[PDB]
Amino acid sequence: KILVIEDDALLLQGLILAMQSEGYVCDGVSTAHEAALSLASNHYSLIVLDLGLPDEDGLHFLSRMRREKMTQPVLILTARDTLEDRISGLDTGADDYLVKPFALEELNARIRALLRR
Amino acid sequence: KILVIEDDALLLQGLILAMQSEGYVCDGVSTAHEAALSLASNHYSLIVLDLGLPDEDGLHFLSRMRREKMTQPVLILTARDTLEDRISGLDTGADDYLVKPFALEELNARIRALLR
Ligand code: BEF
Ligand code: BEF
Ligand SMILES: [Mg+2]
Ligand SMILES: [Mg+2]
């Protein structure tokens, strides 16, 4: 089960379809707030996390998740593309960091890598 | 302890210095052959793997490592930058894939992530 957190609706819907195509169960949410509601009500094996979100920055939310001792693999998937952004994302507790625009099949391969580990 | 497999000597030496700066013990080798000798004689917690190597392609070597049920995190670090290359590297068993040219500090952060 994958949770995708992404505020662009068109992109989010396509990401859900992609995860389902890969044989995962997938829930998509558009805010950090909705993510917290979903994390409380369901168990996820991996989280895909956009950083630019309307209510709380994804990086701040990730910090909170790790402070709550959540250990799910997190892949950051974001338009924030600077070297500083990538390093801070990883050091905040992300397991991978993939910049937009990106190919769907690379996302799939990186999710496979994260999961078999 | 980190093993770095990279055939460009100037780059390899700098990578070793970088790993040591991060507080790791680090051995560097320039071929898949030397890597196999080192893997037999030492225990490594992570392997950094270049693909273009003189005697055996790094991707082929990685396939052999995984077939021998070696479970060390492997980060591929390579000039091979096509989408097919990246996917192939990951699916062959790499845990991350970072294309050249790259920043040392991103390599460091990705190695930290893998070791977590
Ligand atoms: F909104 Be994101 F970070 F692409
Ligand atoms: F020789 Be590599 F793949 F940069
Ligand atoms: Mg966004
Ligand atoms: Mg080479």
In the reported structure, the alpha carbon of residue A109 is separated from the centroid of ligand 3 by a whole-number distance in angstroms of 22
Backbone angles phi, psi at B92, to 5 degrees: -70, -15
In the reported structure, the alpha carbon of residue A1 is separated from the centroid of ligand 1 by a whole-number distance in angstroms of 22
Method of determination used here: X-ray
- Between B86, B90, B96, which is nearest A112 by CB? B90
Looking at residue A90, the DSSP 8-state letter turns out to be H
What secondary structure does DSSP assign to B32-100, as a single string? HHHHHHHHHHS--SEEEE-S--SSS-HHHHHHHHHHTT----EEEEES--SHHHHHHHHHHT-SEEEES
Supply A15's token pair.
């990401």
User: Which ligand is the nearest neighbour of the Cα of B7?
Assistant: 4
Contact predicate A110/A75, CB 8 Å? yes
Backbone angles phi, psi at B115, to 5 degrees: -75, -25
**Tokens 């060390």 appear where?**
B72
What is d(CA B2, CA B73) in angstroms, rounded to the nearest whole number?
A: 10
Site to substitute for ligand 1 among A50, A55, A56, A92, most atoms within 8 A of C-beta: A50
Cβ distance A96 to B94 less than 8 Å, yes or no, reads no
Whether the CB of A51 sits within 6 Å of ligand 1: yes
Residue of minimum CA distance from atom 1 in ligand 2: B52
Supply A48's token pair.
């895909």
CB contact burial B77-114 (16+ within 10 A = b; e otherwise): bbebeeeebbbbbbebbbbbbbeeeeeeeebbbbbebb
- Between A87, A94, A105, which is nearest B105 by CB? A87
Query: Could you give all domains of chain A from N- to C-terminal order, each with its CATH number?
Result: 1-117 (3.40.50.2300)
Cβ distance A83 to B91 less than 8 Å, yes or no, reads no
User: Torsion angle of alpha carbons A84, A86, A90, A94, nearest 10°?
Assistant: 140
What is d(CA B100, CA B77) in angstroms, rounded to the nearest whole number?
A: 7
Cβ distance B87 to A105 less than 8 Å, yes or no, reads yes
User: What resolution does the deposited structure have, in angstroms?
Assistant: 1.7
CB contact burial A65-79 (16+ within 10 A = b; e otherwise): beeeeeebbbbbbbe
Q: Which of B6, B5, B19 is nearest to B111 (CA)?
A: B19
